[PDB]
Amino acid sequence: KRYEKLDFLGEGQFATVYKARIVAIKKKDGINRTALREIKLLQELSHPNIIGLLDAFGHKSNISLVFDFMETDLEVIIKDNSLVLTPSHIKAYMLMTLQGLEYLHQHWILHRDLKPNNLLLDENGVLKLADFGLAKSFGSPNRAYTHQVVTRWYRAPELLFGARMYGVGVDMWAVGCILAELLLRVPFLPGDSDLDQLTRIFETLGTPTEEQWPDMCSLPDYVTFKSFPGIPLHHIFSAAGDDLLDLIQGLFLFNPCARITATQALKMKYFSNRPGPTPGCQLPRP
Amino acid sequence: ALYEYQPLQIETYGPHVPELEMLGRLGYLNHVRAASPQDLAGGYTSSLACHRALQDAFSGLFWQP
Amino acid sequence: MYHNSSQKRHWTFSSEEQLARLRADANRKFRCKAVANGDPVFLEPHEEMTLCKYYEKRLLEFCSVFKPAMPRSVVGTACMYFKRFYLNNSVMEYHPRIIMLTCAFLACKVDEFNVSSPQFVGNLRESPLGQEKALEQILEYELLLIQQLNFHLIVHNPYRPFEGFLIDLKTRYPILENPEILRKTADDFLNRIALTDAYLLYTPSQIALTAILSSASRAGITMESYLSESLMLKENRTCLSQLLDIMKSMRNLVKKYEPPRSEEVAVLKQKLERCHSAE
Numbered sequence: 001k002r003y004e005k006l007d008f009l010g011e012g013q014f015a016t017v018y019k020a021r022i023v024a025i026k027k028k029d030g031i032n033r034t035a036l037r038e039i040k041l042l043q044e045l046s047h048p049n050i051i052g053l054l055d056a057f058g059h060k061s062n063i064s065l066v067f068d069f070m071e072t073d074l075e076v077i078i079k080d081n082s083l084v085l086t087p088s089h090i091k092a093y094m095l096m097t098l099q100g101l102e103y104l105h106q107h108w109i110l111h112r113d114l115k116p117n118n119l120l121l122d123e124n125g126v127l128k129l130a131d132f133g134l135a136k137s138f139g140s141p142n143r144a145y146t147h148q149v150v151t152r153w154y155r156a157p158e159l160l161f162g163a164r165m166y167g168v169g170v171d172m173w174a175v176g177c178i179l180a181e182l183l184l185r186v187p188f189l190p191g192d193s194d195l196d197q198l199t200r201i202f203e204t205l206g207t208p209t210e211e212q213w214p215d216m217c218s219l220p221d222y223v224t225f226k227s228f229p230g231i232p233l234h235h236i237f238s239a240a241g242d243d244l245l246d247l248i249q250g251l252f253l254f255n256p257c258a259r260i261t262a263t264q265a266l267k268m269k270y271f272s273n274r275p276g277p278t279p280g281c282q283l284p285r286p
Numbered sequence: 287a288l289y290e291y292q293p294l295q296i297e298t299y300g301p302h303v304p305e306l307e308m309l310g311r312l313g314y315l316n317h318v319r320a321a322s323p324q325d326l327a328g329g330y331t332s333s334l335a336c337h338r339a340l341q342d343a344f345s346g347l348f349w350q351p
Numbered sequence: 352m353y354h355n356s357s358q359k360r361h362w363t364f365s366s367e368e369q370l371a372r373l374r375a376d377a378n379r380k381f382r383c384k385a386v387a388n389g390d391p392v393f394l395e396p397h398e399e400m401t402l403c404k405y406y407e408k409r410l411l412e413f414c415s416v417f418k419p420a421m422p423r424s425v426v427g428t429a430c431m432y433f434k435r436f437y438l439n440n441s442v443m444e445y446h447p448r449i450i451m452l453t454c455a456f457l458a459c460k461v462d463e464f465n466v467s468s469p470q471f472v473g474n475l476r477e478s479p480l481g482q483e484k485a486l487e488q489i490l491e492y493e494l495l496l497i498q499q500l501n502f503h504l505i506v507h508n509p510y511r512p513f514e515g516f517l518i519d520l521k522t523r524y525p526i527l528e529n530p531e532i533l534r535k536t537a538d539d540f541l542n543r544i545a546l547t548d549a550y551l552l553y554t555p556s557q558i559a560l561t562a563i564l565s566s567a568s569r570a571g572i573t574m575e576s577y578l579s580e581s582l583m584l585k586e587n588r589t590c591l592s593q594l595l596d597i598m599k600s601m602r603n604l605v606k607k608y609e610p611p612r613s614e615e616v617a618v619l620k621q622k623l624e625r626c627h628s629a630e
């Protein structure tokens with residue numbers, strides 16, 4: 001085509017990503033449904049904090065997708081010991097993630113794969129949601145989805161309890177986990193199994209009650225845990241202010257209906273309080 | 287260099303859709319199927335279906351090709 | 352959302368004349384290729400349109416008896432794919448019986464209607480070897496169909512707007528005591544609007560509202576106050592004029608629709624298979 005290969009960027013089990021000239025090219029059942037999902041969703045979306053699909057082409061039952069080239073991701077930022085993550089940096093990353101997510105949610109799409117390495121960063125410091133291979137439209141009672149979505153460490157408790165019907169909470173919980181990972185620099189809730197994921201969630205944040213989550217027991221794979229009191233958030237996050245703790249509390253509410261939406265999160269005092277989010281050019285470059 | 291919220295202003299080219307919060311107040315939710323407790327526990331409410339249906343009904347109703 | 356969708360941006364055209372131009376370009380360009388390769392073998396554009404209408408009916412009833420039951424959104428997506436494909440391609444180059452199956456096959460994936468290729472092809476009345484050969488043909492044409500759609504796969508159908516209008520009527524228009532009796536006759540009218548080119552000329556909301564008001568008129572209920580005071584069009588008079596004109600134009604597209612004649616199709620199919628056996 002009109003794109004000359006320059007570098008090999010990565011290998012996921014459904015596609016090989018390579019730099020090209022700068023863009024990133026991602027190369028009996030027919031064309032793969034993950035690629036078709038990416039095409040069909042990203043063609044209908046245009047926002048600065050969502051990865052832009054620039055073109056698609058291919059041959060036979062193969063296909064390649066052209067994307068804006070991204071410099072790094074949030075996982076590399078988190079794991080880089082030499083980068084100090086000031087509160088302004090965390091505010092900037094959260095703001096961009098939430099604005100992209102607000103736009104995505106107004107168009108009735110859930111990302112369902114939010115994690116630090118899916119929050120890509122470009123050379124201008126602009127964060128973009130990427131990897132829409134699990135993304136799906138929501139708001140339709142005619143559609144029933146799967147619960148195993150979202151990587152385990154970022155999977156919301158209603159997904160772990162097996163919710164076949166869910167809204168934006170599955171994204172917001174992951175957002176909270178990402179936020180926690182930005183604060184602690186280690187995965188907040190690193191469960192090695194779904195049961196162990198729920199165990200770590202309840203050990204840290206407390207076992208929810210009926211008042212906390214009225215229909216908790218109606219989820220098909222619900223199962224009862226020991227009453228863990230939970231660790232108060234200000235003990236877990238010892239350097240966070242009250243505004244940040246309120247945001248974290250909102251993102252980790254066990255009730256998915258009560259869990260704060262992207263719009264509600266953006267309206268919180270934390271984002272409007274001092275200090276302001278750093279400009280993109282000043283964000284730390286690994 | 288502080289941030290302030292400003293809502294997404296995207297032209298729908300159609301009649302105004304009432305907010306999620308107001309749908310029960312305005313009597314819309316009387317005409318959609320209620321969310322089951324299993325659906326509610328996952329965060330799915332009838333308000334979502336109602337809001338999306340109204341948004342699609344009004345989207346581009348006035349637009350000319 | 353429709354209002355910033357690819358369907359609105361690229362696949363809603365100004366007039367029926369423009370669609371006629373696009374189809375004429377397609378027919379002319381295939382004729383130029385056929386003469387540059389090696390007379391009344393060719394189909395005229397109205398002959399192509401007759402065959403396209405016949406094969407769209409075939410696509411409809413293929414989806415109608417498809418097992419497992421196919422959602423209406425998938426069917427509408429597949430029909431829109433068929434219409435869009437033949438705007439810029441000739442039935443003499445790509446056979447509509449393969450293309451309609453490919454459209455259904457792709458719409459099943461796009462609308463997340465999980466179907467295995469074996470159970471997709473099991474719906475064809477063919478010997479198993481014929482099912483395999485059909486599947487191979489579909490897999491051959493899948494990327495071609497996607498390219499000819501310009502990778503615009505999300506199709507906004509009138510069904511959810513229809514439901515939303517019913518909600519809004521039940522909630523805000525009490526003088527229509529029971530809007531639900533408007534459903535059947537509106538649905539019928541939607542099905543007629545779908546046979547025309549309206550899906551390429553009007554927004555899905557406009558189509559749904561036209562069907563609803565046509566149903567109300569068939570029941571002799573007037574709905575001018577729903578438009579003027581509920582949708583608040585009495586405050587922007589030119590908007591009400593434009594909307595009423597759109598709905599009248601749609602009703603006339605349905606009025607002047609001519610189904611393919613069976614003798615016509617019988618002859619045109621022989622011409623089409625003659626075109627595809629040769630070349």
Ligand SMILES: COc1ccccc1CNc1cc(NC[C@H]2CCNC[C@@H]2O)nc2c(C(C)C)cnn12
Pocket residue numbers: 009010012017024025026051067068069070071072073076117118120130131
């Ligand atoms: C090696 O240096 C790094 C390091 C970290 C992040 C990015 C780069 C280089 N750039 C890059 C890699 C990349 N890897 C494929 C997936 C891997 C799992 N997480 C989602 C990713 O997309 N994908 C893209 C895109 C598109 C295809 C979204 C645009 N840039 N880019």
